[PDB]
Amino acid sequence: MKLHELKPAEGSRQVRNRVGRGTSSGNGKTAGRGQKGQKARSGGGVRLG
Amino acid sequence: ARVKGGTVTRKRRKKVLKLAKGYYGSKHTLFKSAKEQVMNSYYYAFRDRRQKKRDFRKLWIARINAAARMNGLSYSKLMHGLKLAEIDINRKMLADLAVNDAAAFTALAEQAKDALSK
Amino acid sequence: PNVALFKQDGTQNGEITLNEEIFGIEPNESVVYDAIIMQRASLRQGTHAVKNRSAVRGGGRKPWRQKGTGRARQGSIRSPQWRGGGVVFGPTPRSYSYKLPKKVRRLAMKSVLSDKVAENNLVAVEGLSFDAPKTKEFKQVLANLSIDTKVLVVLENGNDFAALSARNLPNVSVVTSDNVSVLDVVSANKVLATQTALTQIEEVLA
Amino acid sequence: MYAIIKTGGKQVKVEVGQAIYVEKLNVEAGEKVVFDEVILVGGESTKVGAPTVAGATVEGTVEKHGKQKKVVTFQYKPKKHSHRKQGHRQPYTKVMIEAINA
RNA sequence: AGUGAACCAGUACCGUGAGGGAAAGGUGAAAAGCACCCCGGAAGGGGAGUGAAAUAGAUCCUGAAACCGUGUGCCUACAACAAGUCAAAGCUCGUUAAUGAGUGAUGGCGUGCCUUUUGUAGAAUGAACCGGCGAGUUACGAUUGCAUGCGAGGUUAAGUCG
RNA sequence: AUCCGGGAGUCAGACUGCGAGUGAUAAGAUCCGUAGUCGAAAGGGAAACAGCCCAGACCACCAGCUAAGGUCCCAAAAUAU
RNA sequence: GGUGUAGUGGUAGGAGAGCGUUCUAAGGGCGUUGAAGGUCGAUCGUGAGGACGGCUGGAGCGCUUAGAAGUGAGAAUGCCG
């Protein structure tokens, strides 16, 4: 293996998902959270159980 | 490692403004005005590709009616006559004949008149 | 696997049979990728910081009132959207290093040296001796064996005159036989190892 | 001298010496083509035949395979935060006419 | 951006006071930083000179947009226009050469963008315009999918040499 | 279709047939059941018109046949029998 | 690779695959016979986008493969000019 031709194994690395970056990606404008409510707030949600 | 937002936005915006050449006033000079106007033009052009094909059919039909009433027929009787004889000319070629080759149009109108004479 | 032997100038002074568990074992290519990536992320010094809202030297007072002024409600002169304010989610001091399990370290070492051997890219030599540290004689030696690429020079021990002579040549790297890494062997085109150092490497990779 | 032919899914008016654009044909440039279906042979006297004129063909030579100019089809729904954009260029072939049926 | 502060900054400025607190980097390799003349009270300008370059002349590297002007090819004083889009005569040009470019009388069709809503052209909400900045990150745990090494086994932590 | 597992969003609906209650067998009223469209659906008809009638847009054409609704002129097709 | 058949409106939301910015490594390159940046053009691709040519400009910058992120702006009665 030469340092100018590296290749990881297939299926081993994936990219990432970035929310709030435009409409056509699928997750712009509220970033998967739906409309209003306690679960749409930063730090929103109820404790486990 | 910090990423300045240097020259990407100006390229995109200048691509949008170039599509707005010829518009009125602040609609070819300001980016927001041009953005909205260009979106509306896209909508209009898609709509009008489909409406074009209707306009020319009405134009041909009215010219054919005009020509046929000179040969003793109307549009609907002449179309029926041509179908009962197995003739398959477009309304486009029919109108083109009606304006250029009146003798060809009369040959055809006589065939139609004989077909529905039965 | 047998490699040919040379002297500081000469010819084919026979051959040298090396281990088959170390120098002839069919390399594994993803293990080498993992080793290279781990080692490169292991050299970072992650010394980077920025100031959030509460570290910027600034104000605790509400700048105007909450209503009436025909304004927009503001909370401090140092908010993320104000010019000169604090940064939301910047770089923090971090580590960047991790460890792979012990059998795959050893598998990557074996695999990279065995790849070097499987293409006649390792060159064995009886000895490298020098009465003074002279760069010019090392370059002559290097051309004596017709070596025209990037080369890793693996030496034994307190062979200090040779390491001095081989420094400073811009195609040459020098390492001792107790200190070879995976990144040293992959980057060079060839390895020039002495007979003594070869047995010493076979003693530690076992 | 006139002839009307069915090509593509449409009809065209034809003449010796003139060049015509048409849907893509499956014939390489420089080779010859025969348009079998003739609808009307005008000119001096017209031959107005039930669907086709018996035994008349039209001969030509392909000159060039090309592409039309580009169309953009863009679609959005006001206030519903969504749009989709697509381009399209259309193939054609150019044909020269020689020897309307004789 | 990075310290509030790359520059005479805890300064100017604000407050009785405790205290709050900025803006502002770049001629050229070398000042060779325009002797002399002309218009003008001066400012400023035009020659002539320096210099590889002055449209590098001190408001001095590059020099975008809003915004303000000057010149021209085409249109416009019987016309109700979300300003375009499709059809189209006349005039004027001649390109990354191909089913060419600018303008356009006249005809059909057509109630901005965003947010929140059962529902919006909305007489519901936001934006004067242009430029810059401005929002799911990391540490440590828990779980699932993928991938690699070993396999009835797997794996080391702190620490020592480096 | 069922079974195991990863990730959600929704818990303000509206009108139009039909069948009931409250109301005065009033309401573009209110509350249930059942079917559709709108929501999240462009295109033709109904002058203009979320929800009615027809019909579900991958794209190109200056080709053809029909749906609901229409054929004196605006405005395409019969001044039809 | 051929050929048939079937499909391809879409808000909340799930799944896939890519475009562009800055920096690191390795390799192969360009540059006062003029880099980046700026301006104009009638050019190419299914989209984000990619080239080539003129003018301006005066010292640095692409491409391939892998890695890491302060990685994309039209709206907050946003902040500064």
UniProtKB/TrEMBL annotation, chain A:
Subunit-structure text: Part of the 50S ribosomal subunit.
- What is one Gene Ontology biological process annotated in the Swiss-Prot or TrEMBL record? translation
Is the keyword Ribosomal protein assigned to this protein? yes
In terms of superkingdom, the source organism counts as Bacteria
Q: Name one GO molecular function term.
A: structural constituent of ribosome
* Residue numbers binding Mg(2+): 29
**What gene does this protein come from?**
rplO
- Kindly indicate whether the keyword Metal-binding belongs to this entry: yes
This protein's UniProt keywords: Metal-binding, Ribonucleoprotein, Ribosomal protein, RNA-binding, rRNA-binding
Gene Ontology CC terms, in alphabetical order:
cytosolic large ribosomal subunit
Put simply, this protein is called Large ribosomal subunit protein uL15
Biased composition range(s): Basic and acidic residues: 1-10
Q: What is this protein's function?
A: Binds to the 23S rRNA.
Q: Which family does it belong to?
A: Belongs to the universal ribosomal protein uL15 family.
Region of interest called Disordered, as start-end residue ranges on this chain: 1-49
Feature: compositional bias, Gly residues: 23-35, 42-49
From TrEMBL, chain B:
The UniProt entry, under Gene3D superfamilies, shows: 6.10.160.10, Ribosomal protein L20
What top-level branch of life does the organism fall under? Bacteria
Q: Which GO terms describe its biological process?
A: ribosomal large subunit assembly; translation
Q: Which UniProt keywords apply?
A: Ribonucleoprotein, Ribosomal protein, RNA-binding, rRNA-binding
Please provide one cellular component term from the Gene Ontology annotations of this protein: ribosome
* Any matching Pfam family: Ribosomal_L20
Is the Thylakoid keyword given for this protein?
no
Q: Which GO terms describe its molecular function?
A: rRNA binding; structural constituent of ribosome
Question: Which family does the record assign?
Answer: Belongs to the bacterial ribosomal protein bL20 family.
Name the chain's protein: Large ribosomal subunit protein bL20
TrEMBL record, chain C:
Keywords for the protein's UniProt record, in alphabetical order: Ribonucleoprotein, Ribosomal protein, RNA-binding, rRNA-binding
Q: Which domain of life is it from?
A: Bacteria
Q: Where is the composition biased (Basic residues)?
A: 59-70
Which Gene Ontology terms of cellular component type are present?
ribonucleoprotein complex; ribosome
Disordered: where is this region?
A: 48-77
Keyword Iron set for record: no
Q: Name one GO biological process term.
A: translation
Task: Kindly list the GO molecular function terms attached to this UniProt entry.
Answer: rRNA binding; structural constituent of ribosome
Please report which protein family the annotation says this sequence is part of: Belongs to the universal ribosomal protein uL4 family.
What does the record give as the function of this protein? One of the primary rRNA binding proteins, this protein initially binds near the 5'-end of the 23S rRNA. It is important during the early stages of 50S assembly. It makes multiple contacts with different domains of the 23S rRNA in the assembled 50S subunit and ribosome.
Self-association or partners: how does it assemble?
Answer: Part of the 50S ribosomal subunit.
Q: What is this protein called?
A: Large ribosomal subunit protein uL4
- Biological source species: Enterococcus faecalis
UniProtKB/TrEMBL annotation, chain D:
Key words of the record = Ribonucleoprotein, Ribosomal protein, RNA-binding, rRNA-binding
- Highest taxon in the source lineage: Bacteria
- One MF annotation (Gene Ontology) recorded for this entry: rRNA binding
* Coiled-coil regions, chain positions: none
- Kindly indicate whether the keyword rRNA-binding belongs to this entry: yes
Its Gene Ontology cellular component terms are: cytoplasm; ribonucleoprotein complex; ribosome
The record's annotation in InterPro entries points to:
bL21-like (IPR028909), bL21-like_sf (IPR036164), Ribosomal_bL21 (IPR001787)
Q: For this chain's UniProt record, which GO biological process terms are given?
A: translation
Function of the molecule: This protein binds to 23S rRNA in the presence of protein L20.
Q: Which family does it belong to?
A: Belongs to the bacterial ribosomal protein bL21 family.
Subunit details for this protein? Answer: Part of the 50S ribosomal subunit. Contacts protein L20.
Q: What is this protein called?
A: Large ribosomal subunit protein bL21
The gene that this protein is the product of is: rplU
